[PDB]
RNA sequence: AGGUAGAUUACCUGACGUUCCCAUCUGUGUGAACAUAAUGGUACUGAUCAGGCUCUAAGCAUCUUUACUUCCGUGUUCGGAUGGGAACGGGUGUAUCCUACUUGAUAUGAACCUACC
RNA sequence: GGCGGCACAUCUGUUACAAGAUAACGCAGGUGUCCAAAGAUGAACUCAAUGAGGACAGAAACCUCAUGUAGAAUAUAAGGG
RNA sequence: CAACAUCUUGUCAAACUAUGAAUAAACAAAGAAGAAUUCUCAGUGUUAAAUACACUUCAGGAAUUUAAAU
């Protein structure tokens, strides 16, 4: 039976990383957040002022407003049988840029490089390039032939039991 | 007459009969509490654009 | 052009400390003699932890002062004069410093009144080299190299070369 | 015998080193992160700092704005280039610190082209009174922040001599004139023009010839009288507000040790092992 | 090659020794004024007679440490599943996920802006 | 049921099951305060402990050097910083 | 012989921990309304000044391409 404190059950959650105490990097306060970005809430116990509630720890949210010192973040919270929208205002020390769209932005960039080539190619009248193939779950690999010149065989059989004492 | 205190039994089955009601799109587009200067710039342009739109209507 | 000039040992600090167990009367006079001896106001040191055996926390107990430069060298000679340049080999620390004690302050014995009284003193001398500032400066404060730092025998040789003092094994 | 050495491996496995520059004793990260923090709603708009560092022989002044990749220097000015403007000796005076601050202000405004409307003060009679650049038409002056570093800010420190030169050059650096050489004007003015240097010069002349020749040896060889300093810094100021725009080979390298490859390193142990085999 | 400002915050730390300094930096001389303290030691300011002795920087070592790789080991544990075996205790088989400590080999920094060489 | 206790308002660690929630008259403890400074800010400094030295002075008084990742201190319970 | 250091050994922690799974939690995989590009482009403000940047139905307006993105 725990208590109803604001920071209950935080012996391990709010502990600093091993050999990671003291000041934070200057990239945390220098990184520029724009409205619409994706950020991850990461409570920093070393800064007691403005510490976000521990339930929002590790939640990926979107930036909805940028203030002189605080970055508004919009995350989803689960209630009895519904989902509500929580709007916060955290200092940059307690957040971190999110890489949730890291690979998506490579596929957005690759299709734009092809499209920029296609418009030019149509200007010269030459046939245009095809769009990149979509990602697929690991497909059944096709048949193949193995050259036996550089192939060695090792027999596999159950092993005689050997005592570990 | 001691009674059972609490149980989470059957609670998840109840919460999913009518599943988690996601918020609508308009929930994410609220603007209350935005930056003060940003709201001032946006209001200034919306007033300027409306007046230009209205004088054409009055012109025709 | 040899760099031995930057390895010359010099006395950079001499500390005279008078430790009396009572506040007032004795401490006022003890500070007075140290001021007359050197020429600067000493400080009044307060106890760190109370000890009922010695009848002493916040009470001011002792007085001490440090002199540097030509004044430090002169007063050391007077302190060694009464000691007759007789220093045991154990008086020297492993860090290259040393010290000794004085039972009667010579000063002025003509008008030696019971008001002034007789106070004993202890001399402690801190040696150094040109280049020791690298550990005391405010910006980029570092550690002096091990070879640059003094040793017990290095201090002893300095004593036996600038004052012709002997060192005993008794 | 007894060691109880607290340097064992159990001590190092838990050790946490400081930031490299703080570990070197060159940067106060608790105050640096305050001079760096641009407002979050001013996206990527630089926050400029005047980085004033005085070595034993040079007054380094820089204008820097911070980025994640590093600190970028918009402009710089040193006191070793003062000989171009007529000041040949005493490059770390309160007087030379003013020239370095003035030179960097005029060098910067020349770069941005905004030096024709922002001129500051020029006459020598107003060197001692407070001046802060103001709005010209409706264009604000170039605002900068004074970064002092690990230097105590006393009431006569030279880091504010540079700031006074910057403000006199027309570049706005917020301040208060309670730490200048004055804090009236002529007391401040004299130190700006080397009055404190050209009174030790005369004082020592009367007292001792040995001390005078020991402290101002290169001044005597240069022929600088204890009266020329006042006019020298006036001319240097005049020659700075007319051409601050910097200036324009091969550098001779000197390699130091170079590393040992795995082959050389392994052969050293094998040879030493062979020596240990025959020696023992 | 060196200095100023940094970003990564030990591949950057620590111990033992070692190499230049031509510029630069440092240590270095002084106390008159701004300023400073019990002390010109610090901080402040004025300077250039000397020096690579320390700092700094570069490298050395079957170096502690730290950082990647393999191995440890598909061994610990685990999600799913019997009218499977056992009096219990606990532990199979099936479709699966798969650590850690240790040990061995390697590395001991990369990189951004400005000035000078 | 009574007697006993407060699990009745309330905090920390643990049971507790690496999101959130979370039982027992489960375990180990805590609150009904204290503070014109123990609030705000600027500056300077570095702590516990250990070794080696110094008249009385010794195991414990005061002074100096070296090592010292916090092993000190932070009003209070415990856990965080 | 203590004791103190230093090197091994045997066995442990719900209120010890460097390391740390499996199962899980919360994102993204194209809705100011299915993309993109080009040209033109205004109101405020940040800014030293901006043609940069921020917000304004990715202010707005016009052309071409386009239904693609486990």
Automatic annotation (TrEMBL), chain A:
GO terms for biological process: translation. One of its GO terms (cellular component) is cytosolic large ribosomal subunit. It holds the Pfam family Ribosomal_L21e. Coiled coil: none annotated. SUPFAM superfamilies: Translation proteins SH3-like domain. Gene3D superfamilies: 6.10.250.3260, Ribosomal protein L21 (2.30.30.70). Keywords: Ribonucleoprotein, Ribosomal protein. GO terms for molecular function: structural constituent of ribosome. Belongs to the eukaryotic ribosomal protein eL21 family. This is 60S ribosomal protein L21, putative. It comes from Entamoeba histolytica (strain ATCC 30459 / HM-1:IMSS / ABRM). The lineage of its organism: Eukaryota, Amoebozoa, Evosea, Archamoebae, Mastigamoebida.
From TrEMBL, chain B:
The keyword Hydrolase does not apply. Belongs to the eukaryotic ribosomal protein eL29 family. One of its GO terms (cellular component) is cytosolic large ribosomal subunit. It comes from Entamoeba histolytica (strain ATCC 30459 / HM-1:IMSS / ABRM). This is 60S ribosomal protein L29. Residues 1-24 are annotated as: Disordered. Coiled coil: none annotated. GO terms for molecular function: structural constituent of ribosome. Keywords: Ribonucleoprotein, Ribosomal protein.
Automatic annotation (TrEMBL), chain C:
Residues 60-157 form the Large ribosomal subunit protein uL5 C-terminal domain. GO terms for molecular function: RNA binding; rRNA binding; structural constituent of ribosome. The keyword Ribosomal protein applies. One of its GO terms (cellular component) is nucleus. Keywords: Cytoplasm, Nucleus, Ribonucleoprotein, Ribosomal protein, RNA-binding, rRNA-binding. Belongs to the universal ribosomal protein uL5 family. NCBIfam families: PRK04219.1 (NF003258). This is 60S ribosomal protein L11, putative. It comes from Entamoeba histolytica (strain ATCC 30459 / HM-1:IMSS / ABRM).
TrEMBL record, chain D:
Residues 243-260 are annotated as: Disordered. Gene3D superfamilies: 3.30.420.100. One of its GO terms (cellular component) is cytosolic large ribosomal subunit. One of its GO terms (molecular function) is structural constituent of ribosome. It comes from the Eukaryota. Residues 229-277 form the Large ribosomal subunit protein uL18 C-terminal eukaryotes domain. Keywords: Cytoplasm, Ribonucleoprotein, Ribosomal protein. It is found in: Cytoplasm. GO terms for biological process: ribosomal large subunit assembly; translation. InterPro entries: Rbsml_uL18_euk_arch (IPR005485), Ribosomal_L18 (IPR057268), Ribosomal_uL18_C_euk (IPR025607). HAMAP family: Ribosomal_uL18_A. Belongs to the universal ribosomal protein uL18 family. This is 60S ribosomal protein L5, putative. The lineage of its organism: Eukaryota, Amoebozoa, Evosea, Archamoebae, Mastigamoebida.
């Amino acid at each position: 039976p725990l208590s109803n404190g604001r920071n209950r059950r935080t012996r391990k959650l709010f502990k600093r990383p091993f050999r990671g105490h003291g000041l934070s990097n200057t990239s945390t306060i220098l990184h520029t957040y724009k409205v619409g970005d994706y950020v991850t809430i990461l409570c920093n116990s070393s800064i007691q002022h403005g510490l976000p509630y521990k339930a929002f720890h590790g939640k990926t949210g979107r930036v909805w407003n940028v203030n002189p010192h605080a970055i508004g973040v919009m995350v989803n919270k689960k209630v009895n049988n519904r989902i509500v929208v929580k709007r916060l205002h955290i200092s940059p020390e307690h957040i971190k840029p999110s890489g949730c769209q890291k690979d998506f932005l490579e596929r957005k960039a690759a299709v734009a490089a092809i499209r920029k080539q296609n418009i030019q190619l149509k200007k010269e009248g030459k046939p245009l390039l095809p769009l990149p193939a979509k990602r697929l779950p690991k497909q059944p690999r096709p048949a193949e032939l193995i050259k036996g010149a550089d192939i060695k065989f090792t027999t596999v059989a159950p092993l005689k039991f050997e005592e570990l004492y | 007459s001691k009674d059972k205190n609490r149980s989470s039994h059957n609670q998840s089955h109840k919460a999913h009969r009518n599943g988690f009601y996601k918020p609508k799109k308009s929930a994410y587009m609220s603007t209350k509490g935005m930056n003060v200067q940003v709201l001032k710039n946006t209001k200034a342009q919306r007033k300027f654009a409306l007046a230009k739109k209205l004088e054409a209507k009055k012109a025709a | 052009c040899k760099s031995d000039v930057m390895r010359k040992i010099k006395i950079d600090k001499l500390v005279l400390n008078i430790s009396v167990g009572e506040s007032g009367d004795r401490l006022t006079r003890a500070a007075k003699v140290l001021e007359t001896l050197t020429g600067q106001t000493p400080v009044l040191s307060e106890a760190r932890y109370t000890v009922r055996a010695f009848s002493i926390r916040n009470d001011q107990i002792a007085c001490h002062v440090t002199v540097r430069g030509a004044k430090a060298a002169e007063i050391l000679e007077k302190g060694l004069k009464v000691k007759e340049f007789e220093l045991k080999a154990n008086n020297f620390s492993a860090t290259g410093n040393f010290g000794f004690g004085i039972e009667e302050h010579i000063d002025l014995g003509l008008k030696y009144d019971p008001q002034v009284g007789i106070y004993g003193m202890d001399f402690f001398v801190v040696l150094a080299r040109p280049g020791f500032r690298v550990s005391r400066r405010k910006r980029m404060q570092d550690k002096i190299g091990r070879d640059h730092l003094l040793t017990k025998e290095d201090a002893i040789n300095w004593f036996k070369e600038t004052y012709e003092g002997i060192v005993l094994n008794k | 015998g007894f060691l109880k050495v607290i340097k064992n491996r159990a001590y190092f496995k838990k050790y946490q080193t400081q930031f490299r520059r703080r570990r070197e004793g060159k940067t106060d990260y608790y105050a640096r992160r305050k001079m760096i923090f641009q407002d979050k709603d001013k996206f990527k708009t630089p926050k400029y700092r005047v980085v004033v560092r005085i070595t034993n022989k040079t007054v380094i002044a820089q204008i820097a704005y911070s980025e994640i990749i590093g600190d970028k220097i918009l402009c710089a000015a040193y006191s070793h280039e003062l000989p171009r403007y007529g000041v040949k000796l005493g490059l770390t005076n309160y007087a030379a610190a003013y020239c370095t601050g003035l030179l960097l202000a005029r060098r910067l405004l020349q770069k941005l082209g905004m030096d024709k409307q922002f001129v500051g003060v020029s006459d020598a009679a107003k060197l001692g009174e407070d001046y802060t650049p103001e709005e010209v038409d409706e264009r604000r002056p170039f605002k900068c922040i004074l970064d002092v570093g690990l230097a105590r800010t006393t009431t006569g420190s030279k880091v504010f001599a540079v700031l006074k030169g910057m403000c006199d050059g027309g570049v706005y650096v917020p301040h208060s004139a309670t730490r200048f050489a004055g804090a009236n004007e002529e007391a401040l003015r004299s130190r700006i023009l080397g009055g404190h240097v050209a009174a030790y010069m005369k004082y020592l002349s009367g007292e001792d010839a040995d001390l005078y020749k020991k402290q101002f040896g290169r001044f005597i060889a240069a022929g600088i009288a204890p009266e020329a300093l006042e006019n020298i810094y006036i001319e240097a100021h005049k020659k700075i507000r007319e051409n601050p725009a910097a200036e324009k080979k091969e550098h001779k390298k000197y390699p130091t040790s170079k590393k040992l490859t795995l082959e050389q390193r392994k052969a050293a142990i094998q040879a030493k092992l062979a020596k240990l085999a025959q020696q023992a």
